[PDB]
Design an enzyme around this catalytic site. Structure first.
Site, PDB file in Angstrom:
ATOM      1  N   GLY A 119      54.480  10.970  -5.695  1.00  0.00           N
ATOM      2  CA  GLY A 119      53.606  12.135  -5.643  1.00  0.00           C
ATOM      3  C   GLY A 119      53.859  13.078  -6.809  1.00  0.00           C
ATOM      4  N   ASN A 160      57.845  -2.528 -12.761  1.00  0.00           N
ATOM      5  CA  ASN A 160      59.115  -2.709 -12.053  1.00  0.00           C
ATOM      6  C   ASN A 160      59.404  -4.176 -11.644  1.00  0.00           C
ATOM      7  OD1 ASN A 160      60.583  -0.327 -12.183  1.00  0.00           O
ATOM      8  ND2 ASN A 160      59.980   0.427 -10.178  1.00  0.00           N
ATOM      9  N   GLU A 196      53.065   7.378 -36.527  1.00  0.00           N
ATOM     10  CA  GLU A 196      52.929   6.003 -36.986  1.00  0.00           C
ATOM     11  C   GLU A 196      52.755   5.046 -35.829  1.00  0.00           C
ATOM     12  OE1 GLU A 196      54.916   7.114 -41.009  1.00  0.00           O
ATOM     13  OE2 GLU A 196      56.181   5.705 -39.880  1.00  0.00           O
TER      14      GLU A 196
HETATM   15  N1  LIG Z   1      62.418   1.781 -12.621  1.00  0.00           N
HETATM   16  C1  LIG Z   1      62.593   2.672 -11.640  1.00  0.00           C
HETATM   17  N2  LIG Z   1      61.592   2.928 -10.797  1.00  0.00           N
HETATM   18  C2  LIG Z   1      61.877   3.922  -9.938  1.00  0.00           C
HETATM   19  C3  LIG Z   1      63.035   4.662  -9.848  1.00  0.00           C
HETATM   20  N3  LIG Z   1      62.944   5.588  -8.823  1.00  0.00           N
HETATM   21  C4  LIG Z   1      61.748   5.397  -8.327  1.00  0.00           C
HETATM   22  N4  LIG Z   1      61.046   4.409  -8.957  1.00  0.00           N
HETATM   23  C5  LIG Z   1      59.700   3.939  -8.600  1.00  0.00           C
HETATM   24  O1  LIG Z   1      58.811   5.048  -8.583  1.00  0.00           O
HETATM   25  C6  LIG Z   1      57.924   4.942  -7.440  1.00  0.00           C
HETATM   26  C7  LIG Z   1      58.157   6.093  -6.488  1.00  0.00           C
HETATM   27  O2  LIG Z   1      58.033   7.314  -7.213  1.00  0.00           O
HETATM   28  P1  LIG Z   1      59.281   8.290  -7.313  1.00  0.00           P
HETATM   29  O3  LIG Z   1      59.531   8.567  -8.826  1.00  0.00           O
HETATM   30  O4  LIG Z   1      60.513   7.870  -6.592  1.00  0.00           O
HETATM   31  O5  LIG Z   1      58.709   9.614  -6.639  1.00  0.00           O
HETATM   32  P2  LIG Z   1      58.599  11.119  -7.120  1.00  0.00           P
HETATM   33  O6  LIG Z   1      58.049  11.198  -8.526  1.00  0.00           O
HETATM   34  O7  LIG Z   1      59.936  11.755  -7.053  1.00  0.00           O
HETATM   35  O8  LIG Z   1      57.560  11.798  -6.123  1.00  0.00           O
HETATM   36  P3  LIG Z   1      57.786  12.356  -4.640  1.00  0.00           P
HETATM   37  O9  LIG Z   1      59.201  12.116  -4.244  1.00  0.00           O
HETATM   38  O10 LIG Z   1      56.800  11.601  -3.809  1.00  0.00           O
HETATM   39  O11 LIG Z   1      57.461  13.834  -4.728  1.00  0.00           O
HETATM   40  C8  LIG Z   1      58.199   3.566  -6.832  1.00  0.00           C
HETATM   41  O12 LIG Z   1      57.378   2.588  -7.451  1.00  0.00           O
HETATM   42  C9  LIG Z   1      59.661   3.336  -7.195  1.00  0.00           C
HETATM   43  O13 LIG Z   1      60.094   1.984  -7.182  1.00  0.00           O
HETATM   44  C10 LIG Z   1      64.094   4.389 -10.775  1.00  0.00           C
HETATM   45  O14 LIG Z   1      65.131   5.032 -10.921  1.00  0.00           O
HETATM   46  N5  LIG Z   1      63.787   3.343 -11.622  1.00  0.00           N
END
Ligand SMILES: Nc1nc2c(ncn2[C@@H]2O[C@H](COP(=O)(O)OP(=O)(O)OP(=O)(O)O)[C@@H](O)[C@H]2O)c(=O)[nH]1
Ligand SMILES: Nc1nc2c(ncn2[C@@H]2O[C@H](COP(=O)(O)OP(=O)(O)OP(=O)(O)O)[C@@H](O)[C@H]2O)c(=O)[nH]1
Ligand SMILES: Nc1nc2c(ncn2[C@@H]2O[C@H](COP(=O)(O)OP(=O)(O)O)[C@@H](O)[C@H]2O)c(=O)[nH]1
Ligand SMILES: Nc1nc2c(ncn2[C@@H]2O[C@H](COP(=O)(O)OP(=O)(O)O)[C@@H](O)[C@H]2O)c(=O)[nH]1
Ligand SMILES: [Mg+2]
Ligand SMILES: [Mg+2]
EC number: 3.6.5.-
Lengths: 130, 430, 433, 428, 429
Positions: free
Chosen positions: D136, D198, D246
């Site tokens: 979100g 991912n 670039e």
């Molecule tokens: N590569 C990677 N993907 C991540 C990581 N943490 C979360 N994700 C991915 O990001 C998505 C979830 O979004 P998040 O970034 O955790 O959520 P947020 O931006 O903090 O938003 P809210 O918590 O909903 O307010 C999922 O697809 C997760 O697998 C991380 O450290 N590495």
């Protein structure tokens, strides 16, 4: 064979004469102003062509200034449109969220109104049972 | 007609320009400190054409080094002859041009141009008799192409009576740095046709092909390409740097080489072709034969595909002047169909005792051939393939440019091709 | 006294001037410092004035629009012979462009040159006129010379003007536009010159290769030979001679019509200094050589033309009896065709002074020599060759923008070319019946 | 000079930020306290009077938990507290909360802090924004931030490192909604976006590093290596440098076509001989090494940027690219005569001590603009359509003030984007 | 999203609620005095979600105990962990509700509701970041059903932006307290459909059947039924109580579980099924298989009779995360037909190292299945059979209710069934 030599001149380091082999068959202002006029006309043509060249280059500088200004105007219009679109969106969203919460609280207020009516109805049975 | 003011702009411009200063310094007996340690008066006779005399007996190149990024300038300073240059003549920005002609010509370059003009004005004002300017740059990038052509236009405005000469590197997909090279090149050619008196077309397509096919370098580097450029630049400037009769100055060269104002793009030729490592013969007849050899051209055009309007041939090293004269006559007589008949005696020859660095004998050809239209056609085809789909155009219109500028630059370059073709087909019975 | 003022214009005029004045000094016993240890002739005063220090100074002006060539004179062997005031230079040359020499650059230095000429003329009690040395092909030799000729006609109305002009040759030429410059300068100069001695660089070049065994002649080789010819022509003005004793006599004896004023020069003998001791050539041998095209200063065939006048100028051990005997045999074997209205004959002059050669030079010292000056209609061949090269380029307007850019109008090309077409027609008409 | 400001949004952006800045410190010899016992590192680090080197970065999240680990971790002295910004309540995997309800309460604070960083720049190149598509905050707050950055900085370059969702590690059913919504809103405000799938990173960790069940730590250390490769051209002065402008000019033919595919090689296990320039370059055209799951054989290349690092010489790069130019299978569009841009940097790939990756002598990261990346949009759009056809979960967004018209508009924009990739790949 | 405020109303509500506090206190290492005596930081990491920190190192449940009769509340005070509760949080009347929804919702309950709101407001106002509310109650009696739904509506009015979660016990003739349970249940469902964000359907029909058939208890007591409920409640709140990525808060759980606002009734599932204090572990494959087993559902519906809209699966204890992932993929692949195709990746899995009290390994399933319509159909049939003859209707009209309220509540619940059926039959087409 018939060669006629005619003496012409004699001097300290020279001697000259004419030799006739056969006689002939048939017996027998610029002005400074004008020059100046031509040079000045040429100088004016040279000067005129150089002036036309510089005039063309001046028109290139004008174009260069118009393109920098155009990039600035496009960036300013982008900022302005981005700003108004965002303000439209946030205000429309605030109005919608407030409307959604007002509708929910109004439903709960109607429930409260109804509950008082239920309690009133009960009083016409409770105590009012002779 | 004494002093020339040299300017080198962008990465390519500064790289070939530094190599030019290294070669001619070696030829003139100048070391990296600027001290003369040669053993010939021929070396110093006309040294003031390219060098200023400074405190002590030192010689300082009349060179201005320009870039919109500091990287190239630092590399030149650290290079072999980097210390010879005047420190105040390094003029550089920090932002870069992002391989974009519009950034070099209109936005970033415009912000740096007055600092460059101040340095070139200082050099020009101290000249007893300024010939003109010599610019080294590429047409495929942003700084050399965009800012270099902006400099040419500004210099033309302040010095409309001086000669403007360029060594312009033409892009090739064979050795490319950016995807927008055909745009940058077409926009630059449009500027060169209008604002230069003489332009040497140094084609990276030709330089690559010489290294690959002739020198058998499987993978040529910029250093291999630049060894051919430095030798070519040494050859084409011989008459300006050493005592001689023919084309001894920039204006006399232009009068002999340029019959029509727009047709001032030269096809340089050089023999023998050598690699940096091939420090291993070439007779006068063999040297002359290379004038019609496409394998010896620094522009990827075939001289047999068109006709020579004018030619300047320069022989260097110990050789018989009589033998050179005989072979030059023989080449014109045996190749009559490759010279326009309506320009009599259009081939001028010069001989200099001093050979270029690393060689015993050499020949350089400066040709004004109608075959140069092949170079412009190649650029035009690459340009059209992109422009037809408006690919990458937003990077130029984003800088304030209009699409009409692209159409106009393309039209002018197509007109240049038609003009060469018109004179190629022209007969002495007009 | 009958003074002559020499004017040397551009590189060709200046470098030929160096060779001439070196030779004159040797002929008159004048050292490079101007001193003369001095019987005697006294006639050398026509070409040399004298200073309060006893120094003999050439009645000459060296002019160039660029300083390099005249700088060698200013610092050379003969730097004391000339006063700095007579060596005049500008900063920037005419870049092989007639329009640049006549209209742009020449305009800034004419007044200075005319002032210096006036100062030399003031030192003359009986000025004859001028001897102008220049090339047809250079921007200065063509452009500046024609501008100078025009002003000289204004300031010295009557006064004779003789030219020594270098006709262009591909073997030594430095510019593709030399045919343009040659026609342009000839057109403007034509009515201002009384007599012009053209020297074709190709003819001199071939004489150096053939007669002197020089593989690749340089300007030094060409100029030393040119100086011998110039000296032969001027000998009767610098020594008490009998033929061509004044400048007007060159026009009287050689020029029947004002426009046809280009005599053909023939010189003999030209012998190598390194020749394994040769027996001296007779009057008959050197006189026969006058009628051989290989010894001419301009490449043309006198068989394809008619003579209007012929002057034989002999120098050295020569007696009239041998000259007459030589001419008698030549007439018996050859057709020396003269025009109908001129007598078939020769004016002969003998100057007793020996032919002088520069020590260490290419020419061998000889006991007798001859220079023939003949006004033949054959010299029109030189104009035809030049006009053809002009037409090839001008048909396409090749290089014309260089001239127009200097303020010259395109119409001047057509006017100059039309004048040379009329000149070619004049040579045809004069040779008619 | 030439400064870049990094913005890490949400859990994914922040955790990837941790891995990146840890790696940058190791690469530049900067200690966790900011002390450093080239000069190009100043593009990413400012200096204080005390000699401390501080990241030109802002960490933002709507919940404090993740950024709290940064505040109390190894690198707590590296960042000034002011650049680590958190709210109290997250966006609950809802774009509407990140963009409106919750995000609006913290935007001004974030922009103020970015302005303070921009004030310390003498030649600001642009912004690098790290976020997920699925969260979100990563979706909604990033879109709001990008819109506000276009207002305050106009056309100043904005580049993204975006995490494309994968079922093996995803935390929300509505991630397809958040992805399409943020892409629609962000599209006109972003100049270039580097998507990282991912599932691709997950599979590379399983296959190349022998990790049975990769965690975010495993994924992020690998991502940290790719980001470092992309930014090494700005943080070091190598043989060939490529700045933000670039990247833009050479990778983006049209404004909307701005999603390059990232490929990295070599990825070798720290257990387990050195791969040549030709071998690592050839590996860039193998789908197994891609950051996004797609098949470039079902598309055309429009641009290719090769970013080398370590023991690499131009001669070897040119030889490797020449053999790639002859490969019939590697197809470019007909309107691209010249498709390669090469950058070389001397510092060999640095690995985090105790990590999964082996230390190698040379590595390369290819950034390619291929029409094959449209496969990723097609997969996401299909999942969006399946749910949206029933209006599943839509009430969560509408409840927060959004309108269904925004869903249709965002989806229509993605349909036009898929069409754009098809049109651009066609022959002339 | 930190604090949850727990409310328990009526006999059933306070009985299952007390058992919930006993289980989670044991899991978190909290004794009946409120002192932490555990040996794991995982226990305290998110302790503040359910507990306040009070004088000394003590933890006090953020729990409000409500009843219209003092009886069950005295029994809770005397029970295990009875002393852990805040004494001022016990709010009770003396009159009772007589297992009549109208008494709980409109009359006796209305007289006590403000005293309850006093206490819940105090708890809520001291929260740094209130998630929302959690109510335990039955739908068949009067206090838990009637007063509980009245509380939900009052709480919603004051906290319209917080999540409202309930653990609602559905009545069954197999273990019944009154003849009017179908009325009380239908009237409560009408309130729940409109005012809750998530409701766990704890069916006494299912609990009885598990005790009778599976556990072989000939005559189950409410203590036997409540052992299944406490285990289920421990399992479903796992993600809220321990550090983790998935469904870590009430709102994120609702966003993942509720595709349509009215369809927020969950079918909880649990494995293994055990009787009180009885030690008997299942493998990960066996644990996963129970997701589709009707014998493991806490709602008397068969998951094979409908389709899962969404599922949250929680595994607890020491086990291979890789094995859990493999088996969960296998269960969706092998049972594709029982998941709606138009909600991609609708099954989310979580693994917690801490198993529930008394077990070594377990699995909890929170399912949003369209099969839950069987539970509502059963209530609706029982309701109709009585309402068709207006039986016992004076028990409600005597409290001031109108017959129209009954028609409306019935209509809404029949609409809820039709909606579940509509999505069960919906295709991706
Ligand atoms: N590569 C990677 N993907 C991540 C990581 N943490 C979360 N994700 C991915 O990001 C998505 C979830 O979004 P998040 O970034 O955790 O959520 P947020 O931006 O903090 O938003 P809210 O918590 O909903 O307010 C999922 O697809 C997760 O697998 C991380 O450290 N590495
Ligand atoms: N005989 C001879 N011809 C020469 C000499 N120098 C130049 N020429 C010829 O003259 C022509 C070139 O003209 P120049 O005299 O050098 O030029 P300029 O008069 O100095 O004019 P610019 O330098 O163009 O301003 C060519 O045909 C040369 O071969 C020389 O010393 N002797
Ligand atoms: N011959 C040669 N070409 C070069 C060199 N460096 C770059 N180029 C060419 O120049 C073009 C790129 O322009 P460049 O000068 O690097 O960009 P600028 O810095 O913006 O002027 C491409 O055609 C390159 O192949 C070099 O050293 N030698
Ligand atoms: N599972 C379970 N159900 C109970 C319990 N106590 C009562 N019930 C059920 O709750 C309903 C009666 O409601 P009850 O809570 O006792 O009345 P209240 O005090 O008015 O809320 C019937 O369906 C009972 O079977 C209990 O401890 N456990
Ligand atoms: Mg000259
Ligand atoms: Mg988050």
């Amino acid at each position: 064979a018939d060669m006629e030599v005619i003496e012409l001149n004699k001097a300290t380091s020279g001697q000259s004469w004419e030799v006739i082999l056969k006689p002939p068959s048939f017996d027998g202002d610029p002005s400074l102003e004008e020059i100046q006029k031509k040079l000045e006309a040429a100088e004016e043509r040279r000067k005129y062509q150089e002036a036309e060249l510089l005039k063309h280059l001046a028109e290139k500088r004008e174009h260069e200034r118009e393109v920098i200004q155009k990039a600035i105007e496009e960036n300013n219009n982008f900022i302005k449109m981005a700003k108004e679109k965002l303000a439209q969106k946030m205000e429309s969203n605030k109005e919608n969220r407030e409307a959604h919460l007002a509708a929910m609280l109004e439903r709960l207020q109607e429930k409260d109104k109804h509950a008082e009516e239920v309690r009133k109805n009960k009083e016409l049975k409770e105590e009012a049972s002779r | 007609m004494r002093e020339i003011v040299h300017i080198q702009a962008g990465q390519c411009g500064n790289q070939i320009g530094a190599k030019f200063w290294e070669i001619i310094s070696d030829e003139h007996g100048i070391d990296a400190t600027g001290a003369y340690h040669g053993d010939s008066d021929l070396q110093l006779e006309r040294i003031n054409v390219y060098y200023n005399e400074a405190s002590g007996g030192k010689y300082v190149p009349r060179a201005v080094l320009v870039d919109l990024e500091p990287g190239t300038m630092d590399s030149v300073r650290s290079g072999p002859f980097g210390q010879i240059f005047r420190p105040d003549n390094f003029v550089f920005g920090q932002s870069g041009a992002g391989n974009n002609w519009a950034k070099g010509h209109y936005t970033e370059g415009a912000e740096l141009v007055d600092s460059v003009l101040d340095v070139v004005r200082k050099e020009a004002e101290s000249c007893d008799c300024l010939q003109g300017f010599q610019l080294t740059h590429s047409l495929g990038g942003g700084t050399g192409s965009g800012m270099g052509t902006l400099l040419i236009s500004k210099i033309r405005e302040e010095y409309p009576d001086r000669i403007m000469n360029t060594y312009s590197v033409v892009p090739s997909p064979k050795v490319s740095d950016t995807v927008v090279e055909p745009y940058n090149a077409t926009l630059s050619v449009h500027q060169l046709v209008e604002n230069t008196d003489e332009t040497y077309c140094i084609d990276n397509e030709a330089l690559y092909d010489i290294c690959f096919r002739t020198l058998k370098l499987t993978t040529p580097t910029y250093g291999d390409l630049n060894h051919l450029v430095s030798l070519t630049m040494s050859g084409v400037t011989t008459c300006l740097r050493f005592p001689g009769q023919l084309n001894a100055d920039l204006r006399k060269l232009a009068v002999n080489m340029v019959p029509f104002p727009r047709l001032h793009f030269f096809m340089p030729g050089f023999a023998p072709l050598t690699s940096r490592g091939s420090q291993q013969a070439l007779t006068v007849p063999e040297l002359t034969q290379q004038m019609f050899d496409a394998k010896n051209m620094m522009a990827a055009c075939d001289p047999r595909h068109g006709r020579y309007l004018t030619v300047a041939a320069i022989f260097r090293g110990r050789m018989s002047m009589k033998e050179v004269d005989e072979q030059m006559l023989n080449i014109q007589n045996k190749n009559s169909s490759y010279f326009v008949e309506w320009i009599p005696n259009n081939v001028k020859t010069a001989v200099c005792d001093i050979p270029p660095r690393g060689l015993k004998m050499s020949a350089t050809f400066i040709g004004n051939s109608t075959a140069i239209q092949e170079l412009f056609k190649r650029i035009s085809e690459q340009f059209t393939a992109m422009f037809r789909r408006k690919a990458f155009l937003h990077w130029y219109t984003g800088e304030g440019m209009d699409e009409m500028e692209f159409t106009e630059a393309e039209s002018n370059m197509n007109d240049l091709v038609s003009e060469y073709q018109q004179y190629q087909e022209a007969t002495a019975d007009e | 006294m009958r003074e002559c003022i020499s004017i040397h214009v551009g590189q060709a005029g200046v470098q030929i001037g160096n060779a001439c004045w070196e030779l004159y000094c040797l002929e008159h016993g004048i050292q490079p410092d101007g001193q003369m240890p001095s019987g005697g002739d006294d006639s050398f005063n026509t070409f040399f004035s004298e200073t309060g220090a006893g120094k003999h100074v050439p009645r000459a002006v060296f002019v160039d629009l660029e300083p390099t060539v005249v700088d060698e004179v200013r610092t050379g062997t003969y730097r004391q012979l000339f006063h700095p005031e007579q060596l005049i230079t500008g900063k920037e040359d005419a870049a092989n462009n007639y329009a640049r020499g006549h209209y742009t650059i020449g305009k800034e230095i004419v007044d200075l040159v005319l002032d210096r000429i006036r100062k030399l003329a003031d030192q003359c009690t009986g000025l004859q006129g001028f001897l102008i040395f220049h090339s047809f092909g250079g921007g200065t030799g063509s452009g500046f010379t024609s501008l100078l000729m025009e002003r000289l006609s204004v300031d010295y109305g009557k006064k004779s003007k003789l030219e020594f002009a270098i006709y262009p040759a591909p073997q030594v030429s430095t510019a593709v536009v030399e045919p343009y410059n040659s026609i342009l300068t000839t057109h403007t100069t034509l009515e201002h010159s009384d007599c012009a001695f053209m020297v074709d660089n190709e003819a001199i070049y071939d004489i150096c290769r053939r007669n002197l065994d020089i593989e690749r002649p340089t300007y030094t080789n060409l100029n030393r030979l040119i100086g011998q010819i110039v000296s032969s022509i001027t000998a009767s003005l610098r020594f008490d001679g009998a033929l061509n004793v004044d400048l007007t006599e060159f026009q009287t004896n050689l020029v029947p019509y004002p426009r046809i004023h280009f005599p053909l020069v023939t010189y003999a003998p030209v012998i190598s200094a390194e020749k394994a001791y040769h027996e001296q050539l007779s009057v008959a041998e050197i006189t026969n050589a006058c009628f051989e095209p290989a010894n001419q200063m301009v490449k043309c065939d006198p068989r394809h033309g008619k003579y209007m006048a012929c002057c034989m100028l002999y120098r050295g051990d020569v007696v009239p009896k041998d000259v007459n005997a030589a001419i008698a045999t030549i007439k018996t074997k050859r057709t020396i065709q003269f025009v109908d209205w001129c007598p078939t004959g020769f004016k002969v002059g003998i100057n007793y002074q020996p032919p002088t050669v520069v020590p260490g030079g290419d020419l061998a010292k000889v006991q007798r020599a001859v220079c023939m000056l003949s006004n033949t209609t054959a010299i029109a061949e030189a104009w035809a060759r030049l006009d053809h090269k002009f037409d090839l380029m001008y048909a396409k307007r090749a290089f014309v923008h260089w001239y127009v850019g200097e303020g010259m109008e395109e119409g001047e090309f057509s006017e100059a070319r039309e004048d040379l077409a009329a000149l070619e027609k004049d040579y045809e008409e004069v040779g008619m019946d």
